[PDB]
Amino acid sequence: ESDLVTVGLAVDQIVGVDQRSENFSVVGTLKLSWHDPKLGFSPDQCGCTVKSFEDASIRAVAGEINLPLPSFSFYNQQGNRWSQNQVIFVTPDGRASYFERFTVTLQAPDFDFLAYPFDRQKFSIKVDLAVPTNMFIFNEIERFQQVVGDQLGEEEWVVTSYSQEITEVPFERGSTNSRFTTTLLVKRNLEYYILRIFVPLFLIISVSWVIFFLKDYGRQLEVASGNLLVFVAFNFTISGDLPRLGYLTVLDRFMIVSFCLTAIVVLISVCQKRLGAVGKQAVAAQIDTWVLVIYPLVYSLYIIWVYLRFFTDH
Amino acid sequence: ESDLVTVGLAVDQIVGVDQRSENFSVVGTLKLSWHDPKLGFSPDQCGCTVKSFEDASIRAVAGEINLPLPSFSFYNQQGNRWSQNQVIFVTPDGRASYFERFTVTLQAPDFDFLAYPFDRQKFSIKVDLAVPTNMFIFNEIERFQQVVGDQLGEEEWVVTSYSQEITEVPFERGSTNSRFTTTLLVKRNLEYYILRIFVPLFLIISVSWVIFFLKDYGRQLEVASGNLLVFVAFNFTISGDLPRLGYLTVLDRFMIVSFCLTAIVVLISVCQKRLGAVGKQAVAAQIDTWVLVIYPLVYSLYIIWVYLRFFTDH
Amino acid sequence: ESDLVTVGLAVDQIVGVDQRSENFSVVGTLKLSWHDPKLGFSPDQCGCTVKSFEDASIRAVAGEINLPLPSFSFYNQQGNRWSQNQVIFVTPDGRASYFERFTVTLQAPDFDFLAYPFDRQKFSIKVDLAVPTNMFIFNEIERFQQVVGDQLGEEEWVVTSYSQEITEVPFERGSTNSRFTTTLLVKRNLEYYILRIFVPLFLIISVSWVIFFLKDYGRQLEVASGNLLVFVAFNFTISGDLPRLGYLTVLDRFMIVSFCLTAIVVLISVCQKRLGAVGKQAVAAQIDTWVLVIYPLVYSLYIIWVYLRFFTDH
Amino acid sequence: ESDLVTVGLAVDQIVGVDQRSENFSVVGTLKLSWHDPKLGFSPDQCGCTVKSFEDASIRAVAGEINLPLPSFSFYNQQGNRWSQNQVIFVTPDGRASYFERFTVTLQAPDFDFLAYPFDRQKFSIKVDLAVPTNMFIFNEIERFQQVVGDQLGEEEWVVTSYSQEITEVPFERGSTNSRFTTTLLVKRNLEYYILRIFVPLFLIISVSWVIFFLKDYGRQLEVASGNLLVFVAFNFTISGDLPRLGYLTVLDRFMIVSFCLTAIVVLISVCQKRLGAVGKQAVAAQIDTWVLVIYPLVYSLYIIWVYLRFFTDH
Amino acid sequence: ESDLVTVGLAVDQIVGVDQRSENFSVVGTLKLSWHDPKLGFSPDQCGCTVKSFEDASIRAVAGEINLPLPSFSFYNQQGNRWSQNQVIFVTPDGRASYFERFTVTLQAPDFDFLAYPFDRQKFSIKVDLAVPTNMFIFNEIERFQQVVGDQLGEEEWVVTSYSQEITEVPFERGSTNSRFTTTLLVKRNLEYYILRIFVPLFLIISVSWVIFFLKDYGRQLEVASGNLLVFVAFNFTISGDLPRLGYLTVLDRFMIVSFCLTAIVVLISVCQKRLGAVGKQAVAAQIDTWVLVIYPLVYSLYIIWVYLRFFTDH
């Protein structure tokens, strides 16, 4: 009669998603529990309510007790898995427990970013038992604590839904072993994005918009050129926040459109300066009044069009 | 009598072509199908129409069934190949199937970029069977779905033609095994290139062109110097989109020519300012009228010359 | 009767804490001492007060003496551990000693930076004996020299508290071995931070503050735009001192707020220039007097609010 | 009687010479030819004029024929060598052939750059046979095609002379094996250098030279400061084309001298502005006339001096 | 009777000292000489004055002669050691020789930079014999050629003193083997530093100093702001020449102080402009005369103070 083991898991943050690296990490907890009568012992010999061991994997205590124990290993791990606060509890009846904080580097496919704020992604963590079916079997999942695992603020990713389930996969020379896979769906956590990149662009565009109120023109033109230089420098300072890809991300569409518009502003300023100096100073005011109300309209139209094209059907 | 197996393949995107790294990746699908009577089974014992297994390579189920199965492995893969949605179907008659999504890191030569938009390149993926000829042989290729594999928008590369075929290569200690090689021809997907690099250069050149309309000269000169600074900064912001090579790419020819022309503009502006302040203000207008129509002509001539030299014979 | 060994340790600096690398290093000393009668020898044969060996680990001299010796190895080391000034002293009575300077690359979890100046962190170094319990056992810890290990100035980290203790962990095929773990708590050593990043920002903000005293407006506006460009460039020059993360660090909050304020300054300057040129030159002075005393107030309020939110309860 | 084999080689381009990496690559061809009567076969059985095999190294066909064959391997290769268009021809008489395109990553010393355009360097490729002397021996070198291997334009390096020769080196447990080493001498291919870095510096220096013609001084001074900023930015944009070294490269001497001269220009402009505003406007013209003819003289003298010091004796 | 061998070494340049990499390289020569009668041979059989072999390590010729030979290997080498011009000479009497140019990648601790021009450092290269004491022993050191090894100009490091000596270290299963360690002391070779970083800063500070001579103020203020921008950009262009560390290097102290002073200059310029426009134009000249002589004094005082604090006692 194979013994039955209950298992739970929880994730506190997921860090380091790189297109080139094709791998990531995860930090969380893990809990194992089962009952085997062979572990039982008389309290008279020990003289203690319970017995415990610290700072050792299941493999080591299994080797030292000379009894089989439910070892495991993550399916796709790379290098080594760090473990702190490892402990294992033994009760006189014969129950057991095991708690471990962990951090694993896992292997991942190549993602398809395209839409940058959207970035709906799937993450999966697989846990496998290193003993055949007859020795031990996963029975039921303990949905303890919060798989969301909110601690403070936010991290590089946020959770939106998840689901754990268990299966059986083939083992060596016949037989099988239990598997326990958790699947996650995540979102880019756009708070940092809106608060760091979009607001400075809004201000830098708005200043170039407002310089049109002037009645002189030379100062207007000088300010326009200076602001275009500042816009180029700002576009640079983002730098490594737009990973080197082949195709276009919506951020890139916005950057290109804003840059073209600012260059148009400087061209219009030169033309207005000449028109004013020639003598037809009346029509310059008309052109100013046209542009003042043309710009916000076109920006709204472009935002709406991009929304329709990239966030719904058709 | 060696059993016969039909195989198909399809590619959805090819990412990460680096001159230094000398390797790339590919993500796609794979399908295998064959028929062996030994797999047959009476429905009375199973009580099911079909039998299936999930999330295991061919090697594992082959080891657990204790029957030979058509395993495989990519010819030049590096590290590990990621697999999702693996499944294998067994029918009571004795047929079989196998579907697997995959992503492989392959080894590649050193390319010769030279012409940057042109970049005609050849990519090849090789699939080999890990069993001798007597056990299994590739028979015919299933041209299923679309080897083009268009999903949405575009990716770092596009497909223009392809061709699959099968051969035989030597195996260990005599005998041979089947091989199935797909060859691709690709193009740089210039849409991102024209929409991100060429249009901003066109605007930045055009503004410096238009400042000549002015009749004052000090403001013209100041604007010219500012625009040359902006052009240098923009040339920088492209940055890592022009990989560090030894030789010249057509983009570099264009950048150098545009920079030289803008420096010429600032020199001409200084000379015109002096000529105007000296007293001969009439000839300055003549020089302006000459330059206004000289520039577009020379740009057209240079574009045509480069086309003739680098895109056809002689 | 297992022989008893006393052990001490000290750390001189800890370098290279990288979020991506997930590892660090440490340089310090180490001392081992114990007594076994078998090592004793008659001074008549040697003719020397003491006997010594140089530049060899414990393993080598243990192999060459053909007597067991207390070897060790760090628990999580990577690659190789560099050793200089290795020496081992043998006294005629039978005592021993061993001194070694060292530098180890250790494995570390993924940290959670969030608050950048705060960065309370935990570092741990584990030393294990490579012989079973019966051969040798750690007895007591020699708290020699200074675990703080102050040498000159400061380094990338500073020490605030520590504690060493010994335990027992399972070994191969039964039995156990001694362990000796030192734990550290560290602080970011904010001196470099305040002296390099904060003072230049204070000056760059202050200059933009002071330009308001002017009575002309065109020069004020030009200076404001120039200063905003300088602020962007300075924000860049810090560059790699703000590691590429997902979330917000308090430095980023400060940068964003300062940038928004400077853009507001340039907008206000344009509006003031128009108001002055229109004819209502009196109210411009009122606006200047308002802003002059509004800015420092808002900066103080923001500093206080951030302190309350991120450095105490609630 | 050891069979005799003739061998040829050719190189089409050499890429990736990095001081830090201490290694490079090479892409070219290779040809092997020899005659052994054991390979002979009667055309009646085959019914074909010749027999061929494709896409396999010599080792594989040697293992499958069960006859010894002249295998080889590059002496210092790293990782794996890529091979395309591999083929081997067998004639009824008993002759043989083998053609292979290849690309190898080789190990290299640390070079001493110093003079950057000069960079005389030595490259060597070694080919070794993996069978003892008795089995096979290199006899004569086939100087086929062009070891220069010019295809189109140029690449990161150019060839100036070469020489191939064969020797014998010790093998395992007595005996020796043939070796075939090709040596190359290369040049930096300065065309890209002169056309991308030197011409923009010439224009940027020339504009600052020409601004002196002016008679006003404020505009002259503003232009001078702007041009010095542009020169700094340009010096940056080269960036990774000047590898991080300790010592000085001739490019660095030129950059430093040009920068110092431009700073001198701005100082002279300030002094001239003050001298003009004081009242002694006559001597300012004399200073202008002095500088106008001083600068080109000093540049010519410096170019000549550097030539004499770093390109000939003494 | 163990044979005696004389050994010499020389170093031509040491390259690649990186704080993060914790390793470096070295390129130099090596010479070995000894005499064993077994190598003797009658000239009648050979018919040659001497016998030689080329391009093979000691191990290979030792394996092929079937006689013991003094092999060696560097103590801390990583990867592979490149060898060119290897040769070994055998004389009829029985003498021997061996010359080899080499380049080795060695392992190194983590250095403590602090003072950047000072950087007194210790480098050590260890050579070990791979045969026990009875076979061969290092006897005396040949101080041939120049351990300084000056060739042309300078390299990333310079030599100031050195000392070689030999010892004995334990070997496998008893016995020992000879060791030969060379120790070096090096200096940063400040010539490049003073000629590339310090002179441009001196000029950039001096121009901002000299602009005070002016009598107008608007132009002075504009120039001051422009020069501060140029100073920021220049501080950037050094970039990777100041490695990312935690603590302060003397270069950083100088940069921060200069930046603060230039910001003070721009503040003073604004205040002077207002004071002049208000009407009290006399005191502005007094302030100019004060600053003109205040600045050089404070710079001299700061240089002296830093010298006293960081280059001597107390």
mmCIF file of C-alpha atoms in Angstrom, chain B residues 50-301:
data_model
loop_
_atom_site.group_PDB
_atom_site.id
_atom_site.type_symbol
_atom_site.label_atom_id
_atom_site.label_comp_id
_atom_site.label_asym_id
_atom_site.label_seq_id
_atom_site.Cartn_x
_atom_site.Cartn_y
_atom_site.Cartn_z
ATOM 1 C CA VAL B 50 -8.054 4.860 -27.862
ATOM 2 C CA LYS B 51 -5.094 5.006 -25.490
ATOM 3 C CA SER B 52 -2.935 8.056 -24.843
ATOM 4 C CA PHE B 53 0.045 9.290 -22.855
ATOM 5 C CA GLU B 54 1.038 12.864 -22.081
ATOM 6 C CA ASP B 55 4.104 14.977 -21.359
ATOM 7 C CA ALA B 56 6.889 12.553 -22.204
ATOM 8 C CA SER B 57 9.395 12.190 -25.001
ATOM 9 C CA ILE B 58 9.445 9.147 -27.256
ATOM 10 C CA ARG B 59 12.408 7.744 -25.335
ATOM 11 C CA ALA B 60 10.515 7.475 -22.044
ATOM 12 C CA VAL B 61 7.433 5.722 -23.389
ATOM 13 C CA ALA B 62 9.712 3.496 -25.466
ATOM 14 C CA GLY B 63 11.562 2.491 -22.316
ATOM 15 C CA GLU B 64 8.351 1.875 -20.402
ATOM 16 C CA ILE B 65 6.491 -0.087 -23.111
ATOM 17 C CA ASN B 66 9.553 -2.302 -23.717
ATOM 18 C CA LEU B 67 9.020 -1.962 -27.462
ATOM 19 C CA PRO B 68 11.183 -0.091 -29.980
ATOM 20 C CA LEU B 69 9.941 3.367 -30.951
ATOM 21 C CA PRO B 70 11.136 6.021 -33.445
ATOM 22 C CA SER B 71 13.139 8.387 -31.275
ATOM 23 C CA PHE B 72 14.948 11.379 -32.760
ATOM 24 C CA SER B 73 17.160 14.359 -31.950
ATOM 25 C CA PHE B 74 18.041 17.557 -33.767
ATOM 26 C CA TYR B 75 21.421 17.427 -35.434
ATOM 27 C CA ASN B 76 23.115 20.569 -34.124
ATOM 28 C CA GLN B 77 21.147 21.430 -30.994
ATOM 29 C CA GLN B 78 22.818 23.089 -28.016
ATOM 30 C CA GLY B 79 21.808 22.657 -24.410
ATOM 31 C CA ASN B 80 18.235 21.417 -24.089
ATOM 32 C CA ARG B 81 15.108 21.519 -26.229
ATOM 33 C CA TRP B 82 11.951 22.742 -24.523
ATOM 34 C CA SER B 83 8.757 20.789 -25.137
ATOM 35 C CA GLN B 84 5.134 21.611 -24.350
ATOM 36 C CA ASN B 85 1.835 19.914 -25.206
ATOM 37 C CA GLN B 86 3.604 16.625 -25.881
ATOM 38 C CA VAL B 87 1.147 13.805 -26.542
ATOM 39 C CA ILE B 88 1.095 10.427 -28.278
ATOM 40 C CA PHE B 89 -2.008 8.622 -29.545
ATOM 41 C CA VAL B 90 -2.494 4.874 -29.952
ATOM 42 C CA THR B 91 -5.421 3.426 -31.924
ATOM 43 C CA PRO B 92 -6.694 -0.158 -31.560
ATOM 44 C CA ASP B 93 -5.774 -0.957 -35.165
ATOM 45 C CA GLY B 94 -2.125 -0.127 -34.502
ATOM 46 C CA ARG B 95 -1.628 3.409 -35.769
ATOM 47 C CA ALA B 96 0.232 6.118 -33.887
ATOM 48 C CA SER B 97 0.808 9.859 -33.732
ATOM 49 C CA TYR B 98 2.960 12.376 -31.896
ATOM 50 C CA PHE B 99 2.658 16.165 -31.693
ATOM 51 C CA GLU B 100 5.142 18.484 -30.010
ATOM 52 C CA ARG B 101 5.715 22.207 -29.866
ATOM 53 C CA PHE B 102 9.399 22.953 -29.561
ATOM 54 C CA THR B 103 12.112 25.586 -29.393
ATOM 55 C CA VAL B 104 15.720 24.781 -30.238
ATOM 56 C CA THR B 105 19.006 26.665 -30.095
ATOM 57 C CA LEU B 106 21.034 25.767 -33.178
ATOM 58 C CA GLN B 107 24.608 26.378 -34.296
ATOM 59 C CA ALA B 108 25.301 28.650 -37.247
ATOM 60 C CA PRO B 109 28.227 29.902 -39.346
ATOM 61 C CA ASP B 110 29.530 33.452 -39.540
ATOM 62 C CA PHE B 111 27.425 35.484 -41.948
ATOM 63 C CA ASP B 112 28.585 38.211 -44.342
ATOM 64 C CA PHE B 113 26.241 41.149 -43.820
ATOM 65 C CA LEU B 114 27.577 43.836 -46.153
ATOM 66 C CA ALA B 115 24.327 45.174 -47.617
ATOM 67 C CA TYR B 116 22.107 45.614 -44.549
ATOM 68 C CA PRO B 117 18.549 45.792 -45.982
ATOM 69 C CA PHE B 118 19.422 43.054 -48.476
ATOM 70 C CA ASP B 119 20.821 40.332 -46.180
ATOM 71 C CA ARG B 120 19.802 37.277 -48.157
ATOM 72 C CA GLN B 121 20.455 34.393 -45.764
ATOM 73 C CA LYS B 122 20.106 30.606 -45.617
ATOM 74 C CA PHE B 123 18.825 28.726 -42.565
ATOM 75 C CA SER B 124 18.688 24.954 -42.197
ATOM 76 C CA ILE B 125 17.195 22.621 -39.588
ATOM 77 C CA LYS B 126 18.169 18.945 -39.536
ATOM 78 C CA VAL B 127 16.251 16.106 -37.871
ATOM 79 C CA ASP B 128 17.894 12.727 -37.323
ATOM 80 C CA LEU B 129 16.545 9.388 -36.144
ATOM 81 C CA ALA B 130 18.390 7.674 -33.298
ATOM 82 C CA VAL B 131 17.670 4.137 -34.540
ATOM 83 C CA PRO B 132 19.251 2.247 -37.463
ATOM 84 C CA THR B 133 17.748 1.790 -40.910
ATOM 85 C CA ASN B 134 16.208 -1.626 -40.215
ATOM 86 C CA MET B 135 14.049 -0.319 -37.371
ATOM 87 C CA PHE B 136 12.515 2.724 -39.063
ATOM 88 C CA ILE B 137 12.809 4.856 -42.213
ATOM 89 C CA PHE B 138 11.431 8.237 -43.237
ATOM 90 C CA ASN B 139 9.102 7.671 -46.198
ATOM 91 C CA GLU B 140 7.250 10.842 -47.219
ATOM 92 C CA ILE B 141 6.934 14.414 -45.999
ATOM 93 C CA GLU B 142 3.608 15.781 -44.775
ATOM 94 C CA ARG B 143 3.331 19.366 -46.038
ATOM 95 C CA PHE B 144 0.775 20.282 -43.397
ATOM 96 C CA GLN B 145 -0.366 23.719 -42.204
ATOM 97 C CA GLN B 146 1.973 26.462 -43.528
ATOM 98 C CA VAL B 147 5.768 26.339 -43.371
ATOM 99 C CA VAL B 148 5.484 30.114 -43.700
ATOM 100 C CA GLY B 149 3.647 29.973 -40.374
ATOM 101 C CA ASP B 150 2.207 33.480 -40.347
ATOM 102 C CA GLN B 151 0.565 34.268 -37.007
ATOM 103 C CA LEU B 152 0.351 38.034 -36.405
ATOM 104 C CA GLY B 153 2.269 41.020 -37.724
ATOM 105 C CA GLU B 154 5.850 40.015 -38.401
ATOM 106 C CA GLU B 155 8.925 38.921 -36.492
ATOM 107 C CA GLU B 156 12.670 39.403 -36.805
ATOM 108 C CA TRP B 157 12.639 37.484 -40.094
ATOM 109 C CA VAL B 158 10.303 36.611 -42.943
ATOM 110 C CA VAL B 159 10.205 33.598 -45.253
ATOM 111 C CA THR B 160 10.487 33.675 -49.035
ATOM 112 C CA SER B 161 10.963 30.021 -50.106
ATOM 113 C CA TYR B 162 11.766 26.620 -48.648
ATOM 114 C CA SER B 163 12.235 22.965 -49.536
ATOM 115 C CA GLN B 164 12.360 19.771 -47.479
ATOM 116 C CA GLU B 165 13.941 16.468 -48.461
ATOM 117 C CA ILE B 166 15.255 13.266 -46.916
ATOM 118 C CA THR B 167 18.543 11.395 -47.281
ATOM 119 C CA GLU B 168 20.657 8.770 -45.530
ATOM 120 C CA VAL B 169 23.839 9.351 -43.538
ATOM 121 C CA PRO B 170 26.255 6.828 -41.991
ATOM 122 C CA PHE B 171 25.601 5.448 -38.508
ATOM 123 C CA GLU B 172 27.749 3.634 -35.953
ATOM 124 C CA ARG B 173 29.461 0.376 -36.974
ATOM 125 C CA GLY B 174 27.867 0.149 -40.391
ATOM 126 C CA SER B 175 24.243 0.822 -41.290
ATOM 127 C CA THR B 176 22.604 4.232 -41.742
ATOM 128 C CA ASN B 177 19.679 6.288 -40.469
ATOM 129 C CA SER B 178 17.129 8.621 -41.988
ATOM 130 C CA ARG B 179 17.614 12.386 -42.133
ATOM 131 C CA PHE B 180 15.121 15.157 -42.871
ATOM 132 C CA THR B 181 16.495 18.630 -43.585
ATOM 133 C CA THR B 182 14.457 21.789 -44.136
ATOM 134 C CA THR B 183 16.093 24.789 -45.796
ATOM 135 C CA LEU B 184 14.857 28.367 -45.554
ATOM 136 C CA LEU B 185 15.591 31.664 -47.267
ATOM 137 C CA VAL B 186 14.851 34.829 -45.332
ATOM 138 C CA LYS B 187 14.660 38.612 -45.587
ATOM 139 C CA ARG B 188 15.342 41.324 -43.024
ATOM 140 C CA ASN B 189 11.681 42.512 -42.780
ATOM 141 C CA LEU B 190 12.534 46.111 -43.641
ATOM 142 C CA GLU B 191 9.236 47.574 -42.379
ATOM 143 C CA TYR B 192 10.665 48.440 -38.966
ATOM 144 C CA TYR B 193 13.782 49.807 -40.655
ATOM 145 C CA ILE B 194 12.006 52.239 -42.963
ATOM 146 C CA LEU B 195 9.510 53.306 -40.316
ATOM 147 C CA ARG B 196 12.022 53.958 -37.521
ATOM 148 C CA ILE B 197 15.388 55.053 -38.959
ATOM 149 C CA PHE B 198 14.766 56.496 -42.415
ATOM 150 C CA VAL B 199 11.823 58.832 -41.695
ATOM 151 C CA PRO B 200 13.504 60.669 -38.784
ATOM 152 C CA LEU B 201 16.596 61.202 -40.938
ATOM 153 C CA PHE B 202 14.400 62.545 -43.713
ATOM 154 C CA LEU B 203 12.807 65.061 -41.347
ATOM 155 C CA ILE B 204 16.119 66.072 -39.762
ATOM 156 C CA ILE B 205 17.663 66.678 -43.181
ATOM 157 C CA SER B 206 14.573 68.512 -44.418
ATOM 158 C CA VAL B 207 14.557 71.029 -41.563
ATOM 159 C CA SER B 208 18.172 71.976 -42.262
ATOM 160 C CA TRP B 209 17.201 72.285 -45.918
ATOM 161 C CA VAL B 210 14.291 74.600 -45.182
ATOM 162 C CA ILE B 211 16.125 77.028 -42.895
ATOM 163 C CA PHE B 212 17.718 78.540 -46.012
ATOM 164 C CA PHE B 213 14.497 80.376 -46.876
ATOM 165 C CA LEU B 214 15.305 82.952 -44.201
ATOM 166 C CA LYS B 215 16.529 86.460 -44.974
ATOM 167 C CA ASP B 216 18.316 87.083 -41.691
ATOM 168 C CA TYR B 217 21.487 85.098 -41.232
ATOM 169 C CA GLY B 218 22.447 84.936 -37.568
ATOM 170 C CA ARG B 219 19.344 82.947 -36.683
ATOM 171 C CA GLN B 220 19.938 80.731 -39.709
ATOM 172 C CA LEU B 221 23.470 79.988 -38.534
ATOM 173 C CA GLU B 222 22.416 79.233 -34.962
ATOM 174 C CA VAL B 223 19.692 76.883 -36.194
ATOM 175 C CA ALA B 224 22.153 75.131 -38.494
ATOM 176 C CA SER B 225 24.596 74.428 -35.670
ATOM 177 C CA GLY B 226 21.797 73.224 -33.404
ATOM 178 C CA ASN B 227 20.499 70.885 -36.085
ATOM 179 C CA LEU B 228 23.940 69.397 -36.648
ATOM 180 C CA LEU B 229 24.161 68.648 -32.928
ATOM 181 C CA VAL B 230 20.717 67.032 -33.045
ATOM 182 C CA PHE B 231 21.794 64.926 -36.013
ATOM 183 C CA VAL B 232 24.830 63.649 -34.108
ATOM 184 C CA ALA B 233 22.698 62.766 -31.094
ATOM 185 C CA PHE B 234 20.164 60.963 -33.266
ATOM 186 C CA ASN B 235 22.913 58.993 -34.995
ATOM 187 C CA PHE B 236 23.913 57.894 -31.519
ATOM 188 C CA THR B 237 20.434 56.893 -30.324
ATOM 189 C CA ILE B 238 20.292 54.151 -32.953
ATOM 190 C CA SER B 239 23.367 52.740 -31.188
ATOM 191 C CA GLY B 240 23.208 48.949 -30.976
ATOM 192 C CA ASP B 241 21.140 48.678 -34.145
ATOM 193 C CA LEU B 242 24.392 48.900 -36.148
ATOM 194 C CA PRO B 243 26.486 45.954 -34.923
ATOM 195 C CA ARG B 244 30.191 46.518 -34.340
ATOM 196 C CA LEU B 245 31.822 45.278 -37.545
ATOM 197 C CA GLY B 246 34.937 46.087 -39.491
ATOM 198 C CA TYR B 247 33.592 47.023 -42.892
ATOM 199 C CA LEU B 248 30.951 49.388 -44.268
ATOM 200 C CA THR B 249 27.211 48.814 -44.375
ATOM 201 C CA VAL B 250 24.999 50.873 -46.672
ATOM 202 C CA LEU B 251 23.472 52.548 -43.622
ATOM 203 C CA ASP B 252 26.952 53.772 -42.754
ATOM 204 C CA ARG B 253 27.431 55.233 -46.227
ATOM 205 C CA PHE B 254 24.174 57.133 -45.852
ATOM 206 C CA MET B 255 25.060 58.385 -42.362
ATOM 207 C CA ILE B 256 28.493 59.635 -43.415
ATOM 208 C CA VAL B 257 27.169 61.406 -46.502
ATOM 209 C CA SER B 258 24.376 63.131 -44.583
ATOM 210 C CA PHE B 259 26.777 64.267 -41.863
ATOM 211 C CA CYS B 260 29.226 65.718 -44.378
ATOM 212 C CA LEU B 261 26.397 67.562 -46.107
ATOM 213 C CA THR B 262 25.168 69.121 -42.861
ATOM 214 C CA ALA B 263 28.669 70.304 -41.976
ATOM 215 C CA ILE B 264 28.832 71.854 -45.446
ATOM 216 C CA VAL B 265 25.569 73.629 -44.628
ATOM 217 C CA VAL B 266 27.047 75.241 -41.530
ATOM 218 C CA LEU B 267 30.164 76.320 -43.448
ATOM 219 C CA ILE B 268 28.029 77.883 -46.173
ATOM 220 C CA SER B 269 25.988 79.684 -43.533
ATOM 221 C CA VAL B 270 29.101 81.281 -42.029
ATOM 222 C CA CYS B 271 30.350 82.351 -45.450
ATOM 223 C CA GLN B 272 26.949 83.809 -46.327
ATOM 224 C CA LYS B 273 26.805 85.747 -43.063
ATOM 225 C CA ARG B 274 30.157 87.361 -43.798
ATOM 226 C CA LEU B 275 29.223 88.103 -47.410
ATOM 227 C CA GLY B 276 26.017 89.764 -46.259
ATOM 228 C CA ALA B 277 27.675 91.852 -43.564
ATOM 229 C CA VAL B 278 30.404 93.013 -45.963
ATOM 230 C CA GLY B 279 27.877 94.728 -48.228
ATOM 231 C CA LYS B 280 27.355 92.405 -51.200
ATOM 232 C CA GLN B 281 23.937 91.285 -49.993
ATOM 233 C CA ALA B 282 22.645 90.559 -53.505
ATOM 234 C CA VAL B 283 24.829 87.525 -54.252
ATOM 235 C CA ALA B 284 23.767 85.872 -50.987
ATOM 236 C CA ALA B 285 20.276 85.427 -52.418
ATOM 237 C CA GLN B 286 21.804 83.865 -55.529
ATOM 238 C CA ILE B 287 23.751 81.399 -53.376
ATOM 239 C CA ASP B 288 20.580 80.539 -51.464
ATOM 240 C CA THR B 289 18.710 79.913 -54.708
ATOM 241 C CA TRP B 290 21.548 77.703 -55.933
ATOM 242 C CA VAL B 291 21.718 75.544 -52.800
ATOM 243 C CA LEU B 292 17.935 75.188 -52.538
ATOM 244 C CA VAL B 293 17.850 73.245 -55.812
ATOM 245 C CA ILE B 294 21.305 71.682 -55.583
ATOM 246 C CA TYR B 295 20.608 69.570 -52.492
ATOM 247 C CA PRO B 296 17.634 67.392 -53.567
ATOM 248 C CA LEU B 297 19.351 66.741 -56.882
ATOM 249 C CA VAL B 298 22.503 65.412 -55.225
ATOM 250 C CA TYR B 299 20.516 63.254 -52.816
ATOM 251 C CA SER B 300 18.577 61.669 -55.677
ATOM 252 C CA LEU B 301 21.784 61.091 -57.626
#
